[PDB]
Design a protein around this nucleic acid. Structure first.
Ligand SMILES: [Mg+2]
Ligand SMILES: [Mg+2]
Ligand SMILES: [Mg+2]
Ligand SMILES: [Mg+2]
Ligand SMILES: [Mg+2]
Length: 224
RNA sequence: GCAUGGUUGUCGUCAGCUCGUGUCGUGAGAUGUUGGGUUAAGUCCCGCAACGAGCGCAACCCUUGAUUUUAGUUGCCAGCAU
């Protein structure tokens, strides 16, 4: 339900270098600009509605949603939007086999919870200096990595990614577990590997914000 | 002692040897254990399709080098006479 002028002001139509485009995106290309491909904004607004409509019923049952923000330009732009949805998100680094090997990652989550509970009530000054400093460094180490999904209880029902060229691991292991993926793609990504493709520029903070905001405020009410 | 249990030397106190789940390959297999510095050491951190763990490395043990308290005999003799 995002008007075309909003996207145009967001600079969404921009596409990557002409020398480095994926031919399957020819259906989404509009009058190649100087060294730059420009995409159909009408197709974009058509796809935004479809993704909006889909993402409702996966959380209508108070389900779970996992966002992925590996790209630098979308790191904070997804933390700021997952909190208002009460959902799970990944930043920094995507641990190999986060979804296929959920048992070991869950055990690491339990370890992190134990470390969190270590200092709340009990005593650590009894432990020597090396022990407490090593535990502090350890807890920062697996807090930066895991972060959100800390309270994640069970496998997700949908995914959200920014650059399906940069998290090949995420889509590769999400197609194996048969759970759908919605994400924005550039003029060089793979359409057929994403169920609900949405063509947009991924290199602009504004471009990712104007879509992740629509994703966030379309799930705040769906739970009710 | 080429049928064995037990015990021992050697590579060598060299720093390596593997596993569970995950992933790649039709298959034997592969990653983790490779890449950068770093150290006596897969010791440490960073990076990464891997996440962790186990036996070794290191630490816990004995001795030598300084010092406080209690203890003064058969030990010592500064200050006391023989
Ligand atoms: Mg023999
Ligand atoms: Mg090997
Ligand atoms: Mg050694
Ligand atoms: Mg090395
Ligand atoms: Mg070790």
């Amino acid at each position: 339900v995002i008007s075309m002028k909003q996207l145009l002001e967001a600079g969404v139509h921009f596409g990557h270098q002409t020398r480095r485009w994926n031919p399957k995106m020819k259906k989404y290309i509009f009058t190649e600009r100087n060294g730059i491909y420009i995409i159909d904004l009408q197709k974009t607004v058509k796809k935004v509605d479809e993704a909006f409509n889909f993402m409702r019923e996966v959380a209508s049952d108070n389900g779970t949603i996992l966002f992925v923000g590996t790209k630098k330009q979308a790191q904070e732009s997804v933390r700021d939007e997952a909190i208002r949805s009460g959902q799970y998100f990944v930043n920094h680094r995507w641990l190999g086999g986060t979804l296929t090997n959920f048992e070991t990652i869950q055990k690491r989550i339990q370890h992190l919870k134990k470390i969190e509970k270590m200092e709340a009530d009990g005593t650590f000054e009894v432990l020597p200096k090396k022990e407490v400093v090593l535990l502090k460094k350890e807890q920062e180490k697996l807090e930066r990595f895991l972060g959100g999904i800390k309270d994640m209880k069970g496998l997700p029902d949908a995914l959200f990614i920014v650059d399906p060229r940069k998290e090949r691991i995420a889509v590769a292991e999400a197609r194996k577990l048969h759970i759908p993926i919605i994400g924005i793609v550039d003029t060089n990504c793979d359409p057929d590997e994403i169920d609900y493709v949405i063509p947009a520029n991924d290199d602009a903070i504004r471009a990712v914000k104007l879509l992740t905001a629509k994703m966030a405020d379309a799930i705040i009410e769906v739970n009710q």
